[PDB]
Amino acid sequence: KNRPPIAIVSPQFQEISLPTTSTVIDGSQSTDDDKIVQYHWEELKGPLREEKISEDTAILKLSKLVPGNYTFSLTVVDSDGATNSTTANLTVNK
């Protein structure tokens, strides 16, 4: 009986300064009693006009970040289905 899939994210505070606006958030630390099939990243907060890279992997890659406060949500799916969602906070100061 699989409980859900207990997800955890590589650090929830990721302070960034200009000019180098490129970060990496990871979800390879997400655990379960069996393999995690599906990963899902979704932007919650932050400014607009950013191209996204690999929304369906365990590792985020971002480029050309407008300075603000981004919030993402790692979502894992069990096999068979059980869904857990945790968040991660970004802060891009000048």
Partner: protein, 517 residues
């Protein structure tokens, strides 16, 4: 033999011959009862990540491991090895178990009383046909101690199998180790076997005194032509004349030859200094992580490459260097001063730097309007014309590893360093025979769950014969050799402390002498 008769003597010596050294070791071991005499399925049922799932079995069996170089060489005998020899390889070994004592323990009101058990046996067999999983060569703890006065505990045997997450597959094998013929040993009995190593190459215990790009005469030019200049200074403009030159001394980078450096697989560069590193969690996200069956795995250390370039000693590859530990260093999250990072700076002559590119191949086809654009070669497989060196062996690194029985394998040197062996020295498996406690006077068809709690101890001897390869150098000036610091210190290196704790201060490699390419 009997109870009051010794079944062997303490042989711990090393004899140096003209091209041989026979290192004999003897240690005292202690074998407990593992799993309470049970085989237990183990897995990642308690919530592991996708890369961290395993499935396997834990056995009641112990195994003897002597796959470290300090198990056989003292620091003085290692110093005799590395300052006088261009090569070494093992030839034969000889293994002994003797003076076996089985002790039983009792729960006398919280005060444990330990007594002999003279009629209890200890089962020993060898995996001489290689029909169990070969756990050795994965660089695990529980080998023979470096210092001969230390008593060690025999590690529990267990193996992994095929897994689809934390679950198994139909192709997963289960091995009962009592389905093997094992010699049963009371006190007075002893166990011996001999093993002969196959014809392995010598380990290169020499640095190179020449680099791969400096293998020529500076005095004499070449008769070939190269890329000198692709235009002319015509006062104001250019006209693309496509000129050609020769290179002997002044333009020495682009005379080139028959040979290329070895293959690469680029690591990150991490500084010894904490200030020159990033303030991010680039440990796994910046790792090298080979991908296999849908799960990633750090390469650690991967292919043999140089740790750093000239005069950058504070830099090391992220997972490209063996990292040993100091005395008493904890199991997890220890600082940079609690570890000892080794160094592969002797193979800068032929192997690339691990934290850098291999080269820069072309990407486009240049014509009159667009320019030639290069690339950044970060993974280079083996090309014809490549020469390279393997990874250095260390006094506390492994000796061998089993080459996996596969269809294809190329240059079977173990990536943690050592001797690739198709038939390695076999696993030596040991287990206390279960002595049951008081059974009921009525019959029960269930298995026994109540046993007399007992452990065994004894002495173990390993005797490996090594074949040496002597230096034959015509070098005039003296060579770099491993020496001890002859200054005043609180503790002498590679000795015991005031508390009687043996320690090793630094990793000693083996490439101190030099040979030309």
């Amino acid at each position: 033999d009997g109870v009051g008769n010794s079944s062997g003597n303490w042989h711990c010596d090393s004899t140096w011959m003209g091209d041989r050294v026979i290192t004999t070791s003897t240690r005292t071991w202690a074998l407990p009862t593992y799993n309470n005499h049970l085989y237990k399925q183990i897995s990642s049922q308690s919530g592991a990540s996708n890369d961290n799932h395993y499935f396997g079995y834990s056995t009641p069996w112990g195994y003897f491991d002597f796959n470290r170089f300090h198990c056989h060489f003292s620091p003085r005998d290692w110093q005799r090895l590395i300052n006088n020899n261009w090569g070494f390889r093992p030839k034969r070994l000889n293994f002994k178990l003797f003076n076996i004592q089985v002790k039983e323990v009792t729960q006398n009101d919280g005060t444990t009383t330990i007594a002999n058990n003279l009629t209890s046996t200890v089962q020993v067999f060898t995996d001489s046909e290689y029909q169990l999983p070969y756990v050795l060569g994965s660089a695990h703890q529980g080998c023979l101690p470096p210092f001969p006065a230390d008593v060690f505990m025999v590690p529990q045997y267990g193996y992994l199998t095929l897994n689809n997450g934390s679950q198994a597959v139909g192709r997963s094998s289960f091995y009962c180790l009592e389905y093997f013929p094992s010699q049963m040993l009371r006190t007075g009995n002893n166990f011996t076997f001999s093993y002969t190593f196959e014809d392995v190459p010598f380990h290169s215990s020499y640095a190179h005194s020449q680099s791969l790009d400096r293998l020529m005469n500076p005095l004499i030019d070449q008769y070939l032509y190269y890329l000198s200049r692709t235009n002319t200074p015509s006062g104001t403009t250019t006209q693309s004349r496509l000129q050609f030159s020769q290179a002997g001394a002044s333009d020495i980078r682009d005379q080139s030859r028959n040979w290329l450096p070895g293959p690469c697989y680029r690591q990150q560069r991490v500084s010894k200094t904490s200030a020159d590193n990033n303030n991010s969690e680039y440990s796994w996200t910046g790792a090298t992580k080979y991908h296999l069956n849908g799960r990633d795995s750090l390469v650690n250390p991967g292919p043999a490459m140089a740790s750093h370039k000239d005069d950058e000693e504070k830099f090391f590859p992220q997972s490209g260097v063996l990292i040993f530990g100091k005395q008493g260093s904890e199991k997890t999250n220890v600082d940079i001063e609690k570890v000892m990072i080794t160094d592969e700076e002797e193979i800068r002559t032929t192997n690339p730097v691990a934290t850098e590119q291999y080269g820069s191949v072309s990407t486009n086809l240049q014509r009159g309007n667009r320019q030639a654009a290069t690339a950044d070669v970060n993974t280079q497989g083996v090309l014809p014309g490549m020469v390279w060196q393997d990874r250095d062996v260390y006094l506390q690194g492994p000796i061998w590893a089993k080459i996996p029985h596969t269809d294809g394998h190329f240059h079977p040197s173990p990536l943690m360093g050592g001797f690739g062996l198709k038939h390695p020295p076999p696993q030596i498996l040991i287990k206390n025979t279960p002595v049951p406690a008081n059974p009921s006077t009525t019959f029960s068809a269930a298995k026994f769950a109540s046993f007399i709690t007992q452990y065994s101890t004894g002495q173990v001897s390993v005797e490996i014969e090594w074949e040496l390869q002597k230096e034959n150098s015509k070098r005039w000036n003296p060579e770099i050799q491993y020496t001890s610091n002859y200054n005043k210190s609180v503790n002498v290196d590679f000795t015991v402390d005031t508390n009687g704790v043996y320690s090793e201060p630094r990793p000693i490699g083996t490439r101190y002498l030099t040979r030309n390419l």
